[PDB]
Design a protein around this ligand. Structure first.
Ligand SMILES: [Cl-]
Length: 115
């Protein structure tokens, strides 16, 4: 069902290596809906190539637009399994510290702070 269950570790590593070769300025991001989530919709895809200069505040705005949310729908994003300490950090810096061993950056979204 989840990305890590659909693709082998070998397959995920090789896909991150191809993104380095073909899209060298992009961060490879996996974005999934929390398995408990009732309110927010699912995304149209799983794997996102994010320009490495955007900060987390802008990435939250990008994902809200992609989900076509309105102003009073709540949205919380986990990175590497946990809350973001700051939304001001450039995603290139977030990637270097929070990347998975497969080389993806894993994010999960919910309408409650309680995942
Ligand atoms: Cl690129």
């Amino acid at each position: 069902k989840t990305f890590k269950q659909r693709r082998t570790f070998e397959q995920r590593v090789e896909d991150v290596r191809l993104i380095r070769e073909q899209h060298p300025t992009k961060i490879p991001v996996i974005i999934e809906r929390y398995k408990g989530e009732k309110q927010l919709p699912v995304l149209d895809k799983t794997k996102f190539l994010v320009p490495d200069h955007v900060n987390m505040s802008e990435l939250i705005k990008i994902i809200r637009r992609r989900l076509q949310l309105n102003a009073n729908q709540a949205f919380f994003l986990l990175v590497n399994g946990h809350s973001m300490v700051s939304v001001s950090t450039p995603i290139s810096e977030v990637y270097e510290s929070e990347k998975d061993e497969d080389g993806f950056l894993y994010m999960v979204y919910a309408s409650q702070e309680t995942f």
